[PDB]
Write a protein that binds this ligand. Structure first.
Ligand SMILES: OC[C@@H]1O[C@@H](O[C@@H]2[C@@H](O)[C@H](O)OC[C@H]2O)[C@H](O)[C@H]1O
Ligand SMILES: OC[C@@H]1O[C@@H](O[C@@H]2[C@@H](O)[C@H](O)OC[C@H]2O)[C@H](O)[C@H]1O
Lengths: 497, 497, 167
């Protein structure tokens, strides 16, 4: 048994829809063979796969980070604009590929328009600096009457792209990064880049890079230093996290979102420390701008020869327990709606992705597609503070792991309450009782369930055994929703009226 | 109208009773003419004033910090132990007084025993260091069979004092402090002191010094650095805050608890930053080990000539509005019961104190005595999360100040729920409605109110116009408490059965 | 040192034992004489510093006619011990050490200690503390910093190593 109070008046915050964002890098087949494949039967007049367009629309992704990631730290934006014949072929040192630049930022903006997403554009602070930063904001956002704005117009884009949210480089705390910088070096260049960007266009907002990973030797120290240098000029600090089940321990693997919770809380604390140090009235929020499961493709990638065009890198094939963890991660983002305002599932197409494609072939939905779609589609509104009493377990790395991972989201305009819930229990069903007295006249609309008896079962182009059904048994009786959550399941219990 | 949900299952934390602590320094008349006055008709066999003993006992103060405060940073503990004829007269540079050491630590422990309080003992890290720190812990806490333990026995104290909680110096960040240290210097000496003290007696807890106030140029930076140096060896970090109404603005004055709230949240954040930086599983809590109103006596103090014995320093005479602010401060400590585990009203007797005395004459209760008493006596149990909908106002330094400052404390053992509540509204009553559906069979025991028409009214030895009455109108019907909180009122609504 | 009745019992924080001081340095010198060994004497640079270092060298090595030398004589040891080789503390890089010092803090105090000890008796040699072991996070960095601080005033740098067959 587990219980949960769903009190209308105990609220965390309005969920910023941008926590359902994603990310496309010039990495493997994310662009070339992902969003863009001339000649494909479903390619439109600009070469974009219509099938991929539809799959992304169904996810209702509001914002997509672009073009990197490790790639941006060695990239020249000018290489990807203007007539194709003058675009150079480059050695991308991030992924050891030859980048033709056949797609650059203006074509990416064209694609983003088709899926209804704004773009969170990243500037190179690896090999480049403040002058390229201002020039790109000018190129994208300044109407006309300057060299760079008129250049965009000359390239065929009369109206400025009017990009709101920019990343100040990619995480360069990492020794694997092109133009790695210490926290002071990065802090200083990000501060000066931030200023010139906002002088070109004061309507923008800026994301400073947090650590590439919670396990970095410089974790926390990095964020504190970087914010000390940039606080007044920036709006968000980013965090990144990937998980994997490398020792085949499901119970420990599904507990990993408790760590994500600790990580978010830690970075919020650093933001508030620096706020107090500066005596600033401005609160800095979080952009969780890379998160996912990533591990299945590690061995296969080691066999790819360098200097090919669009190699099949990072092509994890996700299984059902992966979807459960993705589920737990989304609930964790919602739980921190008060301070996490942007998040990006890394990445959107082919590369550790909910959507996979075959060349001259179909596009299909990975297991992780479903909880993400459900969260994005039904998780708009106010995140409510959960009061839960759940049974618990210990695993290798965690203690008092609740079997139940859950939160309710209240959408007053729709008069709906959505309960997202994972039952981590590998053996037993969990009898959830939700107290819903504060929601008068609400009825159960539906109870969606994603479950599969084999946690290692994947989907594929040829069949999808791992798909949601609507046979959940949630029911209202005397101001209480009782629902059975099957063992190892993701549940969406929708209420309304 | 304001509303409030009082749900048993929406809890902040068990309140640590040590948030109702206080503090006695060798400062002015706190000791000499305060707790201790051999000539007094009401002095006991050891010179302790019995009237003061009774006044402290009624506060139920569980812990008292001693002997400083600025005094400790120049103090040699050995000067205050052993036969009185061998105790030296010293120039106390902190308060420019001659300290006779007629009272030292053993006599203080005797006094604390009488009032039922444990002692939070401070070690000198101004002119002294790690050797004096271990020796003092040995003298106080080691049973026997070493030079210092046998010395305590020889001084007349067979059983060890077994002092639990120790301060690593006094706030050393101040340029006015004896033996001021930078955050690095202090962090290092506090770390090395903490280690040897814990090796003498591993049962102890240690408090590291935070900033002397939120306005210090080194605020926040101090706490981060100090904790980076000491995290693994200490248990709490301290904060200090004093307030004053120097510009006669009551509305702004009563809002100041909002700032206290932010100050606490800032120091919690720093603790959690450093925790993450160290990858530690230990959480550090806060000791709010100096807090009060302090300003009334600033001008009188300037005229005191140096090198007297027991000068009348820091003798604020408190008024009614000071009591309201103290009440708001107390509610703010309770609302941070999850992370503030010790707090000390600075100070207990004569010195910015709830109890005042006259030589050979009476002891009396300042205005601030009452809210402190009510919080201490009725505020043991679990602090509940307030969901308050209250009207609000703007003042000079604050926006959206709730007229209602309030929290409930639920004591399961006594089966009581107590609602502490200040109405800051300077002109109008506030009709409070509380949803206590979660508390079956409860009734209103009483509704205590502290109010006076004149915010500047003081108490005195001869008359006390400012005293609580029990004619509040709180009533519980159909699972709802409705009470009228008069304008500018401190309220204690007690429920039971 | 001195009459046994005036020697205090101390809590030795290093090994959590009560040290009676029934044996101190003069009795140790007596024992070392019996086994034919010279003594490599260590000074405390944890809770103590440069004043205690010069005074100990004076007590042990200065012949007579100063407070500390005449004190050794009065304690029953007319001829000076004439200790040749001294340790400037024990390895202070360890977080388990009483009065742990960073490499800079230790380098500075060892330098100033070495100077006064040599001014009392220029015939001595000094050993500066290296790392407590090769696996310390500060290994090598420690030795470079310490020697940068002390090079001109010292003669040796120490190393420590223990081994075990735990697997
Ligand atoms: O989303 C794909 C990439 O993830 C980030 O890369 C890091 C990876 O290369 C490193 O080896 O481990 C930690 C990862 O964070 C990078 O931002 C992006 O290009
Ligand atoms: O409780 C009395 C004293 O308050 C603290 O002293 C500081 C004061 O002297 C300074 O001038 O203003 C701020 C105060 O924090 C001190 O800890 C104690 O002795």
């Amino acid at each position: 048994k587990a219980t949960m109070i769903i009190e209308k008046d105990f609220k965390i915050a309005e969920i910023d829809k941008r926590i359902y964002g994603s990310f496309i890098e010039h990495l493997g087949r994310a662009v070339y063979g992902g969003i863009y494949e001339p000649g494909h039967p479903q390619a439109d007049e600009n070469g974009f796969r219509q099938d991929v367009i539809e799959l992304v629309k169904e996810l209702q992704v509001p914002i997509i980070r672009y073009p990197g990631g490790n790639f941006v730290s060695g990239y020249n934006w000018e290489d990807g604009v203007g007539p194709k014949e003058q675009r150079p072929r480059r050695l991308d040192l991030a992924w050891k590929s030859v980048e033709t630049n056949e797609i650059g930022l203006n074509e990416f903006m064209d694609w983003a328009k088709m899926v209804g997403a704004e773009v969170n554009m990243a500037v190179n602070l690896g090999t480049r600096g403040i002058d390229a930063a201002r020039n790109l904001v000018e190129y994208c956002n300044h109407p006309s009457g300057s060299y760079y704005s008129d250049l965009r117009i000359a390239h065929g884009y009369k109206e400025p792209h009017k990009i709101k949210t920019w990343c100040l480089g990619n995480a360069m705390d990492g020794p694997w990064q092109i133009g790695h910088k210490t926290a002071v070096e990065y802090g200083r260049i990000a501060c000066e880049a931030a200023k010139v960007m906002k002088w070109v266009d004061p309507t923008i907002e800026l994301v400073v890079c947090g650590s590439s990973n919670r396990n970095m030797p410089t974790f926390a120290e990095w964020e504190a230093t970087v914010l000390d240098h940039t606080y007044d000029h920036v709006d968000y600090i980013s965090l990144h996290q990937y998980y994997g089940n490398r020792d085949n321990d499901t119970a420990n693997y599904l507990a990993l979102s408790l760590e994500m919770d600790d990580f978010i809380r830690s970075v919020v604390a650093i933001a508030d420390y620096v706020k107090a140090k500066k005596r600033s009235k401005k609160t800095i929020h979080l952009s969780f701008d890379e998160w996912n499961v990533w591990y299945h493709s590690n061995e296969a990638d080691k066999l790819i020869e360098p200097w090919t065009v669009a190699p099949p890198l990072l092509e994890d094939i996700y299984n059902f327990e992966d979807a459960l963890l993705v589920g737990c991660m989304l609930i964790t983002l919602m739980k921190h709606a008060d301070r996490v305002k942007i998040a990006c599932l890394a990445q959107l197409v082919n590369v550790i992705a909910p959507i996979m494609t075959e060349k001259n072939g179909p596009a299909w939905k990975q297991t992780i597609y479903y909880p993400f779609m459900h969260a994005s589609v039904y998780g708009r509104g106010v995140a409510l503070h959960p009061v839960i009493s759940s049974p618990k377990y210990d695993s290798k790395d965690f203690t008092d792991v609740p079997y139940l991972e859950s939160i309710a989201v209240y959408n007053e305009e729709k008069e709906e309450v959505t309960i997202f819930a994972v039952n981590r229990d590998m053996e037993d069903a969990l009898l959830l009782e939700c107290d819903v007295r504060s929601f008068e006249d609400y009825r159960v609309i539906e109870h969606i369930v994603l479950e599969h008896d084999n946690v290692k079962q994947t989907n594929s182009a040829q069949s999808s055994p791992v798909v949601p059904h609507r046979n959940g048994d949630a029911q209202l009786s005397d101001r209480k929703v009782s629902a059975t959550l099957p063992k190892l399941s993701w549940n969406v219990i929708r209420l309304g009226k």
